[PDB]
Amino acid sequence: ESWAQSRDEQNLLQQKRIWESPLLLAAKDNDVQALNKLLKYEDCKVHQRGAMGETALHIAALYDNLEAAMVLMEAAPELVFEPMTSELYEGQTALHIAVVNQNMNLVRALLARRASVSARATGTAFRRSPCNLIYFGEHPLSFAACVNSEEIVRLLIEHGADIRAQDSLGNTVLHILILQPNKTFACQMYNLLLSYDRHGDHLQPLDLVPNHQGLTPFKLAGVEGNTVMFQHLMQKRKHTQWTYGPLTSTLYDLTEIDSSGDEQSLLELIITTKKREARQILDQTPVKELVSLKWKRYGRPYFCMLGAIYLLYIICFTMCCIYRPLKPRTNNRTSPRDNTLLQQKLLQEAYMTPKDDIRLVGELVTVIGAIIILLVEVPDIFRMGVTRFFGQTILGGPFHVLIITYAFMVLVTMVMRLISASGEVVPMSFALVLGWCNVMYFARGFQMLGPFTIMIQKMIFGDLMRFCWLMAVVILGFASAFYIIFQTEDPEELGHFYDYPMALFSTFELFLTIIDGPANYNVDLPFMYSITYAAFAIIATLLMLNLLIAMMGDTHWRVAHERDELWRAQIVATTVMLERKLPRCLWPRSGICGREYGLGDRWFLRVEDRQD
Amino acid sequence: ESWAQSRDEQNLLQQKRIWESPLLLAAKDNDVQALNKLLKYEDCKVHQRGAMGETALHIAALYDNLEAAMVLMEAAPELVFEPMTSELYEGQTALHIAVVNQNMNLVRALLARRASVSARATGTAFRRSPCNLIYFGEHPLSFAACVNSEEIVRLLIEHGADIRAQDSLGNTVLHILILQPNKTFACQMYNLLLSYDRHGDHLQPLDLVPNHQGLTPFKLAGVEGNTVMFQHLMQKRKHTQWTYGPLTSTLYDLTEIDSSGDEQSLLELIITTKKREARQILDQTPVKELVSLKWKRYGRPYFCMLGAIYLLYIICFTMCCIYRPLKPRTNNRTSPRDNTLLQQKLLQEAYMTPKDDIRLVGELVTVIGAIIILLVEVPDIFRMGVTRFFGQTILGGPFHVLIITYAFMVLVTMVMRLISASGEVVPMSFALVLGWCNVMYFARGFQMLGPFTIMIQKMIFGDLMRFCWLMAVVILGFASAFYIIFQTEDPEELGHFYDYPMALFSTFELFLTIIDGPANYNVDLPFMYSITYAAFAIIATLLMLNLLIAMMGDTHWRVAHERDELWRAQIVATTVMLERKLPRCLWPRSGICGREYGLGDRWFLRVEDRQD
């Protein structure tokens, strides 16, 4: 807001103090004849610093003024060593600038003037941020490599440019090229810069150097969705075994893709990132064949078993709620509006007969089953990234919120049964609904409508937490009208609107056409009802056909196939969670070993494919 | 109708009187040998004027007869000075014609015959109108420039063609080129004609000369939706500050785009025009970045505050209507069809207890709030273009009609309470509905379904004020049938149709399936009912599935993305109204100044963008 406004005030102040100076102006427009006049006249202030803290040499280099920049370097050689001093462009020298503008003849000069190639452009304008349109890094080489100047990138290496130099974020130049928008020019520079990693004594060669998040360039390529570079960095891991005409048997490596157990593997990093370009990586030729093997072999069995153990558990919860304790009421009917006939038994008479002891079994089976839920779900939360990283791994798993809410209500139900509290129907009735509707989750195993509850969970897009605001306002408006219309009338005839809370429920039901329009026809209703209700039935009918449309254009001219892509992302998110929770004995590690084959101690995957 | 018919009768009469003349015919077909015979024979009527008032020279020039036209100019030189005299092609000379037909060798001659280049083609066929297929202006240069003849446009300037000459509408030649259908040939002529604005003493140079609507060529380009020329006229306003490799920092001017406060700025002229090509301008690179800054900074706050102050106001109106004065009725039940139990209290007993004084507070809060509405909305109307320009600024604001109707009903409610009038439910029940459903407007702030109440307000297209005619006819037809079928029967059994007004309401409800089909089954209904109602349920079911379709094809094969364009047009229309109503202190002017930067007294905007 104001910081963006404060950039502008400096960029204009920058152009102001150029005009308010004879030196900084002559550099901008390359008036050498009027520049020699100024440098010769007096041992002037050559350290004139404009708004961004920049000397005349920055400005000669910022506007591609080769001829001006030499004169500054001839007059006072101290200028090449001068960085900008402002908080915005801090540390930046004239060398960084000439590289970005690709001024080949100027950059050669500043190196001939022994300019530092290790100078670190720390300013805020270079850090990675959506406020900045560029992330070229922090060093001259990182700037050269991202503008695609093969010549300058070489030229800086003869002068001692450490390729292993990292940013504040730890990203060496190999990470940055993955973060650029132009992919095709970035793969060619990736190859060139490793070629200058010649010397055998390097202690974790460049493409295995992680940043301050632990990510290598390979894993960074997946998190950012750079499909081009993920492929290009993958031929280092292939090993073509044999080729028999149209057949090929490649042997992928999977050391950074498969869950080892020490650091989060690439499949965990693609699910735990907000981007949707990263989910394209799950279609690539080493990964697609691994996800479909964890699942087809060891992910559908352990998910269509724990989806049937849950069903036989909720069927036991259910029968413990149908057959609950209930006795005839002991009070008397207070008002004629009280049709309560029964109330729930106290403990001393709830468990007093054989049929109530079969139930106690099922009720202990239940509440033990709810504690278990809170011992395999809450310890994840309380130990893991309690609320930010939890829902981050969640792609289509609101399940984990509901089933913890299930187990909570079951325990509320227990306590209330122990202290003989009135109102056990309130917790149960949540637990029933939350308990069964979680069985909608144990469906994706077979490609049920679980690939299509992707929709109803994708249907927490805009027009379904947002059509509330323009439906609820209709309900509150006509319900408050309907109420005052029948506020004078006899409710034993038409009693849809006898109190304000029932006027909203009735009006909610009338919006959806799940009760019939009020009518008696043996009594004169108000004339002000039929006018009002005719409009409600119209606003309600049209708002239920702008949303059918809105749910359509957000599905057909918009996404209908990335839902099939979203399925493959839930197959992973499921597979990862099971492999994290289930023990190693039930989960054989995917891929074949290498110790008994001479390939090392890595865990390869073989893929046999036909070219054409 | 008849005026178009009267053009034709002259165009045929024009060809008639050519055939009924030996002179006008010889010109049409270029018979010089039979033309010299006619001019030499006798000092003839060379002033023969056909239907449109045209002499032989117009016709030689209208049909590209170079050889005939010279003979007329050699015989009698007085012809070049002769305009057409008819009301349709008034003022037009032979010079105007040769320019349009691009006859390069003929036009040189008429200038050699000292023909006026200031002659003003005033006729109705040249004025701007949908009845005319061309608007080439009123002068020879304006005709040359719109046919794209670089040669003739130059050639008229050596002979003294004032470029600053304006039409009856004030449009100089620079405005006209924007109004042409061919854009690409018009940008090149725009450049050429300013080049001939050399002399420094001009007193508002050409591209700052307004027409009789005050619009300059820049502002005219936006009103007309000429995206090509809006861009082309915008490089005069850019000022590229610096270029750092792929980065560019341009400094746009915004003097004619932003609301200064003296004349309506370009953002006000694009909303207040009926065209939809003009709304394309809101996506261009100086304007898109300004709308999104007024809003993101100073338009969502002042719109999500006055949208919550309104909600707490209607919640107070509501509670003042639930808790209204009501007492048991004093009369007796007239007929058994009267289930009115209560009636409303008189003033003397309406405010008699502490609970009725808390309400008086909320009722004064209310009616003060309705006067305020009528002091910030009616003074706009009564002062502004009361009914034509009001709804012109309205793009998606029927809100302004409803909220004035709200405040009116609240004051009707007041008066009726002061004079103890019966029927306060009628005004309230409008005010409730109009009051809440206006909260659907204070939603666009967050990109609610307010971008999608664009639909339901776009849904006042054809098939929703127009499907009425083919639904209402079904209702009136079967309701008048249902009525006469049960006009003989006992209504205490089936009384959906006991009077004609309830027969239309019931039938309205049955069309929409918001009440159940009539039935008793303990009594023999007419056989003529089941035949009729079976057809109604079919016509009703099919007419509710031709419109689902009609609302679809008008959304999916038709517009689904210009609604996203329509949002950005309401962001402006909202932003303009707030900036007009709210004071200057709460509204800092957008864009940075120039006085403290040497750029002048203009109000620039900086945009930093990455090329590729």
Ligand SMILES: CCCCCCCC/C=C/CCCCCCCC(=O)O[C@@H](COC(=O)CCCCCCCCCCCCCCC)COP(=O)([O-])OCC[N+](C)(C)C
């Ligand atoms: C974790 C370890 C334990 C934690 C603490 C344990 C708590 C222990 C104590 C709790 C409550 C205090 C004692 C009982 C109150 C009696 C007063 C009364 O009249 O109650 C009435 C209402 O019912 C209630 O008031 C019961 C409240 C249910 C639990 C809290 C709400 C949970 C859902 C909140 C929403 C969350 C949203 C979730 C969204 C998914 C009685 O019920 P009734 O229906 O009026 O009529 C009888 C019904 N019956 C005869 C048919 C059966």
Ligand SMILES: CCCCCCCC/C=C/CCCCCCCC(=O)O[C@@H](COC(=O)CCCCCCCCCCCCCCC)COP(=O)([O-])OCC[N+](C)(C)C
């Ligand atoms: C701005 C400054 C002030 C202006 C002048 C102030 C005017 C002052 C005086 C006005 C009316 C004259 C006195 C009362 C008439 C009594 C006769 C009678 O039987 O009435 C009946 C009908 O109700 C009416 O006749 C009331 C009329 C309401 C106001 C006018 C209509 C506004 C909406 C028009 C549409 C516009 C379309 C809008 C589209 C959005 C009585 O009501 P009831 O329902 O039959 O039964 C009682 C109801 N109750 C007990 C439940 C409460």
Ligand SMILES: CCCCCCCC/C=C\CCCCCCCC(=O)O[C@@H](COC(=O)CCCCCCCCCCCCCCC)COP(=O)([O-])OCC[N+](C)(C)C
């Ligand atoms: C996105 C989803 C939104 C939420 C869903 C929204 C819909 C539903 C949600 C919530 C509605 C809750 C209303 C009922 C609770 C109030 C008290 C009550 O029960 O009735 C009392 C009256 O109370 C009133 O008259 C106050 C009603 C004012 C409006 C309340 C909603 C405010 C907006 C907030 C929501 C923003 C909505 C979004 C758009 C702005 C008593 O009534 P009674 O017993 O008949 O006695 C009457 C007295 N008499 C007999 C003397 C005459």
Ligand SMILES: CCCCCCCC/C=C\CCCCCCCC(=O)O[C@@H](COC(=O)CCCCCCCCCCCCCCC)COP(=O)([O-])OCC[N+](C)(C)C
């Ligand atoms: C469009 C804008 C809004 C329309 C009118 C605004 C409102 C009306 C305007 C003003 C107030 C009413 C007039 C004075 C009193 C008359 C008698 C009366 O109150 O009610 C009587 C009949 O009602 C009528 O005879 C109403 C006559 C008005 C026109 C009919 C409205 C419907 C048609 C237009 C439809 C438009 C769509 C048509 C198709 C496109 C009986 O009704 P009640 O409730 O039994 O009365 C006694 C109640 N009490 C015992 C409690 C006392």
Ligand SMILES: CCCCCCCC/C=C\CCCCCCCC(=O)O[C@@H](COC(=O)CCCCCCCCCCCCCCC)COP(=O)([O-])OCC[N+](C)(C)C
């Ligand atoms: C775009 C939206 C259009 C508007 C909505 C359209 C639908 C609704 C709008 C309006 C309908 C209004 C009808 C009711 C008012 C009339 C009087 C009345 O109430 O009943 C009286 C009878 O009256 C009649 O019998 C006359 C009905 C003739 C047709 C009226 C509509 C004309 C078309 C105009 C519209 C063009 C529609 C467009 C297509 C052409 C009395 O009835 P009763 O009390 O039972 O007494 C009967 C006497 N008996 C007992 C002796 C037997």
Ligand SMILES: CCCCCCCC/C=C\CCCCCCCC(=O)O[C@@H](COC(=O)CCCCCCCCCCCCCCC)COP(=O)([O-])OCC[N+](C)(C)C
């Ligand atoms: C398609 C064109 C239109 C159809 C026929 C046109 C009309 C009929 C033609 C002519 C008039 C009726 C015939 C004479 C009198 C018979 C008895 C009578 O009136 O009603 C009796 C039964 O009704 C019948 O028995 C009707 C017999 C005709 C054929 C059945 C029609 C439905 C089938 C075809 C469906 C087509 C779709 C099939 C699937 C595609 C009893 O009825 P009521 O009302 O209780 O009578 C007493 C009333 N009163 C006490 C007031 C006196």
Ligand SMILES: CC(C)CCC[C@@H](C)[C@H]1CC[C@H]2[C@@H]3CC=C4C[C@@H](OC(=O)CCC(=O)O)CC[C@]4(C)[C@H]3CC[C@]12C
């Ligand atoms: C008390 C004893 C004798 C009987 C009750 C045992 C089972 C019938 C219940 C109680 C514990 C339950 C489990 C506890 C928690 C979970 C984790 C949760 O599964 C997942 O989160 C897998 C999907 C994913 O992680 O994406 C929901 C099912 C499951 C296996 C439950 C399935 C049903 C179980 C095995």
Ligand SMILES: CC(C)CCC[C@@H](C)[C@H]1CC[C@H]2[C@@H]3CC=C4C[C@@H](OC(=O)CCC(=O)O)CC[C@]4(C)[C@H]3CC[C@]12C
């Ligand atoms: C007493 C209860 C029944 C009152 C009304 C229900 C509410 C308590 C709401 C709050 C949140 C709702 C739940 C939110 C999300 C879902 C997931 C949805 O299922 C899925 O998307 C697939 C299953 C999964 O992913 O877990 C089914 C409806 C359900 C259970 C909803 C059911 C109704 C709930 C429990």
Ligand SMILES: CC(C)CCC[C@@H](C)[C@H]1CC[C@H]2[C@@H]3CC=C4C[C@@H](OC(=O)CCC(=O)O)CC[C@]4(C)[C@H]3CC[C@]12C
């Ligand atoms: C009597 C006092 C003590 C309390 C009542 C004050 C407020 C709760 C009310 C009454 C005056 C109302 C305002 C009067 C008129 C308007 C203009 C109108 O807004 C617009 O037209 C903005 C959108 C646009 O112009 O496109 C509707 C809301 C607003 C600000 C109203 C919002 C709610 C306000 C501030």
Ligand SMILES: CC(C)CCC[C@@H](C)[C@H]1CC[C@H]2[C@@H]3CC=C4C[C@@H](OC(=O)CCC(=O)O)CC[C@]4(C)[C@H]3CC[C@]12C
């Ligand atoms: C006593 C009343 C309730 C009888 C029936 C209602 C009618 C008086 C009609 C006449 C015009 C209608 C209104 C015309 C347009 C709109 C805007 C529409 O909202 C929007 O398009 C967004 C809000 C806005 O832009 O103001 C919601 C329905 C509503 C309020 C309509 C509600 C019903 C109204 C008030």
Ligand SMILES: CC(C)CCC[C@@H](C)[C@H]1CC[C@H]2[C@@H]3CC=C4C[C@@H](OC(=O)CCC(=O)O)CC[C@]4(C)[C@H]3CC[C@]12C
């Ligand atoms: C909206 C388009 C697409 C279709 C046309 C529908 C409406 C404009 C019409 C159809 C019939 C009309 C109704 C016919 C009769 C009445 C009864 C009238 O009240 C009375 O006559 C009181 C006494 C009684 O109802 O017997 C109030 C207006 C109302 C509801 C009318 C309101 C407007 C309605 C719903």
Ligand SMILES: CCCc1cc(O)c2c(c1)OC(C)(C)[C@@H]1CCC(C)=C[C@@H]21
């Ligand atoms: C989308 C616009 C909603 C709308 C606006 C209306 O004006 C009306 C509506 C619906 O339905 C009918 C025609 C039945 C009403 C009749 C009575 C009144 C007072 C109003 C009519």
Ligand SMILES: CCCc1cc(O)c2c(c1)OC(C)(C)[C@@H]1CCC(C)=C[C@@H]21
């Ligand atoms: C703006 C007022 C006119 C109008 C036009 C309509 O097309 C419709 C209106 C009202 O309300 C009802 C509910 C009667 C129609 C039913 C059929 C459909 C799907 C649309 C509805």
Ligand SMILES: CCCc1cc(O)c2c(c1)OC(C)(C)[C@@H]1CCC(C)=C[C@@H]21
């Ligand atoms: C779009 C055409 C509407 C239509 C036309 C009809 O001919 C009939 C219709 C509907 O529905 C059935 C078949 C139930 C009627 C049975 C009775 C009569 C007398 C007619 C039948």
Ligand SMILES: CCCc1cc(O)c2c(c1)OC(C)(C)[C@@H]1CCC(C)=C[C@@H]21
């Ligand atoms: C022309 C007469 C034949 C006919 C054909 C139909 O297809 C339909 C007809 C009538 O009416 C009903 C309402 C029974 C059908 C219901 C299902 C749909 C959506 C269409 C309706």
Ligand SMILES: [Ca+2]
């Ligand atoms: Ca029903």
